[PDB]
Amino acid sequence: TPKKYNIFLASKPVDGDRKWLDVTNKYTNDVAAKVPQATHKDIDDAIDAAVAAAPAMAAMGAYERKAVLEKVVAELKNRFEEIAQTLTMESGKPIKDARGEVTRTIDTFQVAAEESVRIYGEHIPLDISARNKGLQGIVKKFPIGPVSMVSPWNFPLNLVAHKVAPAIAVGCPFVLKPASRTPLSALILGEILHKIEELPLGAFSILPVSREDADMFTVDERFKLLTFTGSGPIGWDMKARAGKKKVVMELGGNAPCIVDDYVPDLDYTIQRLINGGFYQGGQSCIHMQRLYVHERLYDEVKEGFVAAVKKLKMGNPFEEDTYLGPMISESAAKGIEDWVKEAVAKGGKLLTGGNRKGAFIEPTVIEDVPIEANARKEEIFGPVVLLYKYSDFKEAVKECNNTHYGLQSGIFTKDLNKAFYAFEHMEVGGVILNDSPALRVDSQPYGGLKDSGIQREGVKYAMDDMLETKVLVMRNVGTL
Amino acid sequence: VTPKKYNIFLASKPVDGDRKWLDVTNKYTNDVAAKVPQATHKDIDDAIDAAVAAAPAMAAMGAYERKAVLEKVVAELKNRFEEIAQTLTMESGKPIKDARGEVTRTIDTFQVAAEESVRIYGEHIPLDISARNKGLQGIVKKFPIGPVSMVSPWNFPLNLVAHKVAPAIAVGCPFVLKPASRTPLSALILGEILHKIEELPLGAFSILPVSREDADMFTVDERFKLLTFTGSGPIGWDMKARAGKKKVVMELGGNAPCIVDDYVPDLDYTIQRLINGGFYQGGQSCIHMQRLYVHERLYDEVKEGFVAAVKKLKMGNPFEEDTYLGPMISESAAKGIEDWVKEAVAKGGKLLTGGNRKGAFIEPTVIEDVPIEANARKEEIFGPVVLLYKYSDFKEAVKECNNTHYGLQSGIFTKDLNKAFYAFEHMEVGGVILNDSPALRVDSQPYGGLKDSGIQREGVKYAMDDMLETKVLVMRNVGTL
Amino acid sequence: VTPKKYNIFLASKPVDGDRKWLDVTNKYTNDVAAKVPQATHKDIDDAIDAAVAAAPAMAAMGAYERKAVLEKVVAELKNRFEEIAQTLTMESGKPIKDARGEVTRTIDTFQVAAEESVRIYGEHIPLDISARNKGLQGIVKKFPIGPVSMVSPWNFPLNLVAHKVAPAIAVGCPFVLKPASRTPLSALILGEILHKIEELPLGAFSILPVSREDADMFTVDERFKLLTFTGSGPIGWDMKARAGKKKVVMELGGNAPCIVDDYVPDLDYTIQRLINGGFYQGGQSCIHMQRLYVHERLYDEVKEGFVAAVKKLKMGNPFEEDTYLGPMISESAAKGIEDWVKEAVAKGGKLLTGGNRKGAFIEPTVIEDVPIEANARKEEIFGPVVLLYKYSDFKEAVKECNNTHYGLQSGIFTKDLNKAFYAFEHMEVGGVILNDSPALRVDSQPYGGLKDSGIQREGVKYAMDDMLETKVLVMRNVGTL
Amino acid sequence: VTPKKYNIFLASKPVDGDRKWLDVTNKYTNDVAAKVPQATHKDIDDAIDAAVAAAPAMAAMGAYERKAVLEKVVAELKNRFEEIAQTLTMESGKPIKDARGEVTRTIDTFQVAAEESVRIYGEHIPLDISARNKGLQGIVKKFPIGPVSMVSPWNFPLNLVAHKVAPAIAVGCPFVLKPASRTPLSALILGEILHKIEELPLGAFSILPVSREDADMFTVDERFKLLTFTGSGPIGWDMKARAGKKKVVMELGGNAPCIVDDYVPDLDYTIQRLINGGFYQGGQSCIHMQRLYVHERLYDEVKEGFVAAVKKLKMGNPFEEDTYLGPMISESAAKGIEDWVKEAVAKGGKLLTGGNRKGAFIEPTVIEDVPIEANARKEEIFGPVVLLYKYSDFKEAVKECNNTHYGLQSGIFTKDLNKAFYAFEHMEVGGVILNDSPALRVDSQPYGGLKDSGIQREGVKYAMDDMLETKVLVMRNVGTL
């Protein structure tokens, strides 16, 4: 029997005679939930409520914003296993990874609670020259206003938290469009937020939306900021059609990793490479897709990495010992299977995996895949790693940069100069030193260059995009 | 009489050749004072390719090298001060006093940039915020965004160029600048100066006045990483929409209000400040004080003194030392202002002074009780026109200040501590001027707007932020042997 | 009425043994409520050796571990709230309402510290400021100073301990705390809390009530890297003189003035805040409002309302919920205040209300026109006494506020924007309280003074600065292969 | 032949009169090259009174006025460059190449100060951190500490004066400078420059060479708010102990080590930097590389190359362009170094080169395996002496670097990422130099030490911090109408 859910319109749970949206268990394929789909009239009402709630949201005391965020943390801790279970069910990610995501969501909301009481301003001297005599300024940050949020399916909770927590920390009302394949996590946040008294009426709406209405989140003039996490072609098109609003984009990647040493040893290096290459089954924007190993270490790394790939448990994501769960859909798995077959046909040497079983794709390692192949050129978003050998470090860095993406990169080195050369020359938002590129701390500036997006997430950085600078220029203030 | 032939700058080099000429007129006499080569499509393509090719050398410059470039600009500006001011008055029509004020502010802009070039600080951040993150730390550092497309206006041909060029050099970003076709000489003088600086890599800069048929390259070209525009709102918003993947910075118009709730420190100084605001570059300013709200108790005294001071303002030859008000940029600009004045009056506005046109000249104008229906009240006038209104409630005056689709700057005259900070909190602008008109700008302050006034901030260190990209080095157990 | 036997903390462990007992009395009844072991010279020597030995493990803690310690303190303070508040009234004599307010502020102090422990940011600095410095960059990071010597007061036995202990744990500094001998129980409650926290290394803390013959170790011992003292000025200044090589932080007395130039927002709220400041913890506060300057136009109205409100203040048993004013710390403290009141009156002061003593109790007192010659005006009274004065000129009132050898905090009630910022600019203090009495303190604000009021600032992030040392890694051509 | 008579600066004015003459000798020839008037007790009293009286005008200067003063100093230093460099070599005995390097660094110091003078940022802080603190916000602003006492050294007569004088002017602090009696001309040259600057208020500065009988006023006078000293540790620590209530900043000696674990980028560059460190100002530097720890695998190659490079160093007339090593400050200084070399060799040290004295000259010396028992190893030599040691374990080398009572700076040569950050974490110093000797200092970096090396940091923006006092304006419901 599918569980019937409510959606959130102007802080209130709504159902009515709205069309039902089926949410399936990504392992069994059974309809596990029925979710109301918002109408055009609902989206219009939600945006009007966000505009109407903006003054009350801006008038909240810093401690009130903190109170809201601290109540979210308490509720997430309380409902931990319930949330982790729902997360595995709608996303198909192993229960261990789902627990890791809830843990990181608690961290995100906690970082936001602490940041909400730390929005510092500046007192600036403005008498920089004789003409400017008797001038001083107070620079203060103010909420941008109503925020349009469009979240993904790969991290249905954490990637929602990275938008929702900064908005509340700043005092911005918001309208969130969760991914239609995974809206349950966002709706649990809606259930939590709905019960928080400090939060003004109309401050939030959480609405799964039809394809014919989805465009309102991009074009509506009442929103002051569009913040999107998802597909690059969709994101870039949204940026082009957004109108006057500010745009924040967290898009795909094709993350490389350089192995120039074993740090601290081979066992730990293999372990971090396995973690990166099969991070959420590769269904991550920072999944380690490309692996560059120095020729002197190549055979040892290839052997150990492939042997460890072969040991990974693929199956029921509800099982505690399951490392690799199914892909989001059978079509996603079919797409990955095609790109593996294509990579092999274009000259790639399959070392392990490459076979499909419904929505499951075996953890795959392909050696010497050319740039011509889609597996090398484009984001795979599956459990596939492309292995390459190098002789020159500067050339390895150049090859790491040989992509239209630019999210994160990884580097294993004991060399001081190699580490800082990589930091200087890698065309990414984050360089991971002595871990794979799939590492992210929820307080770090996270984002990319090139096709990977614009701006940074990470609580205090996302808060910056939701804030507007205002200066009070004071002429001879304090003169009697 | 004989127009001076200028060179344009292609990949750091002065060019002329078999190129079409652009006429630059003296805005007072209407004589062709200068002839400027117009860049071809191939020139713009070559300029952008050179900017891409110069990006690594720009990024590899030492902070002291970027400082030396900026300090050499300051030295050259000081050296050629009067020559630059005279060229500025000639191509823009702004009085010589205002043109000298602009050269002074440009020196300040380049000087603030020189000091900021050696102060691009990074952060050392702890990343072990929770047990799962044990042994993690980060180094957050800022890097140049890459090639920048610059599109500058005609109202401040030098300082509004400086506010884009100086941050780009301070950061180490190569650039291709499209100066306004009506006023490109100021930008070409900077080009002459930059061309002689050895520290600046080859291809680091291009200053190309371009025809309408090629102007779109500055918007759509994928090789540029940032588009920074100052000018007309409808043009700007359209450029933002068609820019593609690049980041966009916009400095657009305004409909700046001012509240007079007290005389600070006295009536004479208030009137004087209200005159500077209302007739800031003949109103041809994005922060020109267009709307004036005076408290009912002060109204008759302010109206009388302000109108009497407007009547004393010298309008004429901008080369004359005592000229306060020069001509508008064109006769069509003046005709447009004249129409909006006539329309404001027809819709119920009471003309207090001025309103008449003489070619490109518009008399300093004050109109009382102009309704929202009139274009003079709804839209940016960009002329020497001030709309006077009376208020009885302060909260209502703040609400009326906010009653616009613009949000650049606002002014407030008050002796009241709470009124001052209420205005700072509730005025929907980028900058609240306390005890001065909204026309005040310090070249180091964060400058920009909300609503249709634009996106992001200029002011050297703030413009540098938009030309920088954040990168974090996440370090796992670094320092463990 | 059996006294409760307490343990002291030596190298993180509860100790008792055959140590001399110190009596801790209930400041209302005068009964011995607690018996506390007094540390020997060998105990202090062992405590300091353990702090030196624990310094590397303290410095090696993850930021999240220091956070966990502080968060566990917050949880325990919340859990034992009423028990702690009751112990506080008992040993200090402050009303239970004020004791509960102190426990709340202590939870705030420890909470701010927990959040600050994960926010110790460093700097990435360019060092190529000139040609000679080519290829240089730096990483500036902050490190724990090392073992800290803490000497805490009796007026805030818990919160003024928290303002030293919480920053030390947030940074990762081991410490040896000497609590006030009249009020050590609050510090020993923190000790039993810390003793149960596993994350905190062995020897990280010691809390030792000491004899007069050994008290000097906290000043002179070379093993301590920082001395942080809150208390009496003559004692503090003498400790600074004899401290040796270590850094010194001093939070000393005050003679806090307040200017009433307007009623903000109204008279009722102004009187309420003036009563709060003037009788803050019975005046036993380093920010107690001792001097009140009222404008001549407001004088009679303020005097009448303030004196009428003083007359309504409930003085008695501090355990009673409706008690506003409790007894002084000792009968000699009350006798001292009584003498200074009699002396102020003898030298020309006009007693408006109070001035009488009943054992350790002093009636809330208001004295008008007390000359500078009198001790009540010249020195810190540390009692429920307010000296009322009239002024005609605001600049003169600010000058009179500054006419003291103290300089902790000052208050100002004004609706005038310029008066507020004139006071901020010219008041010779660490904190200017705008539209509240000088007795206001937020546990995150920079708190401290000028002149005889001390050196440096407390307030979590500011106190953390004094417990940190700057280290730069100067890097030559790092990243060159 | 005839000594040049100089003026001293009393309350901004050049004074001479009937004052006693202080002889300043040419440190190479020993001839009296200059005669300076020595200030009397009354002069010092007048200077301090003028500094107190000038403090309000100093604090009221616009940021641009403080900048103009500093920019005028930079212009004058550039103008008188060779004259200043020659005067420096003459009074200090340092080679002309090093004296020119010092004048360059002084221009950098004053230039960094000019830029910092217009960047004294304050904070806007939310204070509503909890419900009890509702409606509270703060403005944190920094104010000049007041009159400063400056006591400068003889090893850098100009730059180490600049590192006190430039921050004081950048902040707006009046000062009284006691230059070293052996080298006061550099300080007096600054006084001449400063005396002609109109922007600087009357009484803002005094540069007074003072007799031993009057020198104590700089330590004990209550009118000074800060004592900043650079010199001998035992003198400095004694000044800190007797300073009274004022804040104290100390830049004292060192015993700087260097670890050679790799050649970075090569052996030739490594030797060159080691030579620079070991013989930096003839070792008469607080950051002179006194101890060299080389890995056993590199030892014989480093020893051979370093000793061969030492043998090539030109010692002689400091006015000669090719002179690397000049004489010591006095013959007694050289005799002291000679004794410690003889003592080191008697206690088991193996002399590899030098060790001989010729008047005030000490040959560049390298001694192998000197024990901790010897004064050369335990104490600051402050001469051209390097102690060479071999190590097998890196962690042990870091521990041996820390095996000193000083802690100013350390150096490390490494290609290892973890070794570099282990050294940054565990070296007990204020600065770790990576892939250069410890003798490296950028005039903008935080410079200072731990242990006996002093308290606080110099480096313009850091020294400015010590000359500033924090003030918070706590605002209750400001902006509520």
Q: What is the C-alpha to C-alpha distance for residues D139 and D151, in angstroms, rounded to an integer?
A: 34
Alpha-carbon torsion angle A318, A324, A328, A332, nearest 10: -150
- Residues of chain D contacting A120 with CB distance shorter than 8 Å: 123-126
What residues contact residue A307 under an 8 Å CB cut-off, 6+ apart?
A: none
Breaks, C-N > 2.5 A, in chain A lie after: none
From chain A, the residues in CB contact with B431 under 8 A are 470-473
Whether A130 has its CB under 8 Å from any CB of chain D: the answer is: yes
**In whole angstroms, how large is the CA radius of gyration of chain D?**
24
With CA atoms as reference, report the closest residue to A204 among A225, A186, A219, A216. Answer: A186
**Do the Cβ atoms of D145 and A160 come closer than 8 Å?**
no
Contact D472 C430 (CB under 8 A): yes
Instruction: Tell me if A331 is assigned to a ligand binding site.
Output: no
Q: C419 at the A interface (CB within 8 A)?
A: yes
d(C-alpha C285, C-alpha C305), whole Å: 23
CA distance A218 to A155: 21
D77's CB contacts (< 8 A; 6+ apart) are: D84, D103, D106, D107, D110, D193
Rounded to an integer, what distance in angstroms lies between the CA atom of residue D399 and that of residue D391?
11
Residue type, C24: V
**SS3 call for B402:** helix
Q: Strand pairing of A20-24 and A31-36?
A: antiparallel
Inter-chain CB proximity C62 and B134 less than 8 Å = yes
A154 labeled binding residue: yes
Mutate to test the interface with D, among C105, C425, C445 (most CBs of D within 10 A): C445
Nearest to A374 by CA among A335, A413, A412, A408: A335
Pairwise CA distance, residues D17 & D23, whole Å: 16
Q: How many CA atoms lie within 13 A of C152 on its CB side?
A: 31
DSSP H or E run through D256: strand D256-260
Question: Does a cis peptide bond (omega within 30 degrees of 0) precede residue D174?
Answer: no
Contact D126, D201 (CB under 8 A): no
Distance CA C438, CA C410 (A): 5
Residue with tokens 């004791």: C99
The sign one gets for the Cα dihedral A144, A148, A150, A155 is positive
C240 close to C218: Cβ distance less than 8 angstroms:
no
Task: Give me the sheet containing D21-25, strands edge to edge.
Answer: D4-5, D32-37, D21-25
List the 49-88 stretch of A: residues with Cβ below 8 A of D: 61-63
How far apart, in whole angstroms, are the C-alpha atoms of residue C139 and residue A182?
A: 43
A59 secondary structure, DSSP code:
T
SS3 content of chain B, % helix, strand, coil (to 5): 40, 25, 40
Reduce the DSSP state of residue B334 to 3 states and report it. helix
Tell me the C-alpha distance between A475 and A136, whole Å.
7
Is the bond preceding residue B265 a cis peptide, omega within 30 degrees? yes
User: What distance in Å separates the CA atoms of residue D380 and residue D372, rounded to the nearest whole number?
Assistant: 12
Residue C280 is classified by DSSP as G
Interface membership of A417 toward C (CB under 8 Å): yes
A399 in Cβ contact with A245 (< 8 Å): no
CA neighbor of D191 nearest in space, from D47, D448, D12, D446: D12
Half-sphere exposure of C166 (CA within 13 A, CB side): 32
DSSP string across C34-103: EEEEPBPHHHHHHHHHHHHHHHHHHHTS-HHHHHHHHHHHHHHHHHTHHHHHHHHHHHH---HHHHHHHH
Q: Does residue C55 contact residue C146 with C-beta atoms inside 8 Å? A: yes
Domains of chain A listed by start with CATH number: 1-252+442-480 (3.40.605.10), 253-441 (3.40.309.10)
Flag whether A99 is marked binding.
no
Which residue intervals of C172-245 are DSSP H helices?
185-195, 217-220, 233-242
- Residue C475 touches partner B, C-beta closer than 8 Å: no
The DSSP code for B200 is S
Give dist(CA C250, CA C127) in Å, integer. Answer: 35
Residue identified by tokens 């300082």 is B159
Let me know: does C344 contact C370? Beta carbons within 8 Å: yes
Contact B126 C139 (CB under 8 A): no
Contact between C227 and C246 (Cβ < 8 Å):
yes
State which H helix or E strand residue A51 sits in: helix A40-58
Please give the span between the terminal C-alpha atoms of chain A, in angstroms, as a whole number.
Answer: 76
Residue C33 CA, distance from chain mean position: 25
Question: With the C-alpha atoms ordered D375, D379, D381, D386, is the resulting torsion angle positive or negative?
Answer: positive
- Comparing CB atoms, the residue among B133, B135, B415 nearest residue C417 is B415
Please report where in the chains the tokens 């945006």 appear, as a residue.
Answer: A47
State the burial class of residue B297 (Cβ atoms within 10 Å of its Cβ: 0-12, 13-18, 19+): exposed
Handedness of CA D17, D23, D24, D26 (dihedral sign): positive
Bridge partners of D123, per DSSP, are: A122, D140
How far CA A45 is from CA of B184, C15, D168, D385, in Å, comes to 49, 67, 61, 81
Residue in the structure block whose two tokens are 């009540």? C376
- Asked if residues B61 and B201 have their Cβ atoms less than 8 Å apart, the reply is yes
Q: Are B196 and B102 in contact (CB under 8 A)?
A: no
Of residues D476, D465, D471, the one with CA closest to residue D171: D465
Question: Is residue A440 a known part of a binding site?
Answer: yes
The alpha carbon of residue D481 is apart from the nearest alpha carbon of chain B, in Å, by: 6
- How far D53 CA lies from chain C's nearest CA (Å)? 15
> DSSP for A115-174?
HTT---EEEEE--SSGGGTTEEEEEEEEE---EEEE--SSSTTHHHHHHHHHHHHHT--E
- Could you give the CA distance from residue A53 to residue D16 in angstroms, rounded to a whole number? 75
Among chain A residues, the shortest Cα distance to D129 is held by A63
- Cβ of A128 under 8 Å from any chain D Cβ? yes
Residues in chain D with CB shorter than 8 Å from the CB of B395 are: 481
For residues C95 and C84, give the distance between their C-alpha atoms in angstroms, rounded to a whole number: 13
Closest CA to D466 of D247, D305, D280: D247
Per-residue exposure over C17-51, b if at least 16 CB sit within 10 Å of its own CB, e if not: eeeeebebbbbbeeebbbebbbbbeebbebbbebb
With both helix axes pointing from N to C terminus, report the angle between D233-242 and C233-242 in degrees, rounded to the nearest 10. Answer: 170
B379 catalytic residue (yes or no): no
* A-C contacts at Cβ under 8 angstroms: 37
The reply to whether residue C481 touches residue A423, judged by beta carbons under 8 angstroms, is no
Q: Which of A420, A434, A469 is nearest residue B476 as measured by Cβ atoms?
A: A434
CA–CA separation, D66 and D49 (whole Å): 22
Contacts of D123 in chain A (CB under 8 A): 120-123
What's the token pair of residue B276? 């500077």
- Report yes or no: D126 at the B interface, CB cutoff 8 Å: no
> At a CB cut-off of 8 Å and minimum separation 6, what does C60 contact?
none
Query: Does A124 sit within 8 Å of B476, measured CB to CB?
Result: no
- B450–A423 C-beta distance less than 8 A: no
With b for 16 or more beta-carbon neighbours within 10 A and e for fewer, the B162-184 pattern comes to bbbbbbbbbbbbbbbbbbbbbbb
| D133 closest CA partner among C115, A68, C444 | C444
Q: What are the phi and psi torsion angles at B108 (to 5°)?
A: -60, -45
**Chain D residues in contact with C429 (beta carbon < 8 A):** 471
Of D302, D432, D414, D282, nearest in space to D357 by CA? D282
Q: Is the dihedral of CA C424, C430, C433, C438 positive or negative?
A: negative
The two structure tokens encoding residue A241: 């059609």
CA nearest to A256, candidates A451, A445, A436? A436
Of the candidates A94, A84, A86, the one whose C-alpha atom is nearest the C-alpha of residue A32 is A86
Instruction: Using DSSP, state whether D366 is helix, strand or coil.
Output: strand
Instruction: For residue B39, give the DSSP letter.
Output: B
Cα C38 from Cα A151, distance rounded (Å): 62
- Could you tell me whether strands C13-15 and C8-10 are parallel, antiparallel, or unpaired per DSSP bridges? antiparallel
In this structure, which amino acid lies at residue B389? Answer: Y
Residue in chain A closest to C424 (alpha carbons) equals A478
Strand partners, D455: D250
Written as six digits, the tokens of B89 are: 């008055």
What are the residues facing B53 on neighbouring strands?
A: none
3-state secondary structure of A241: helix
B478·D417 Cβ contact <8 A: yes
Active-site position among B71, B76, B251, B368 = B251
Contact C105, C159 (CB under 8 A): yes
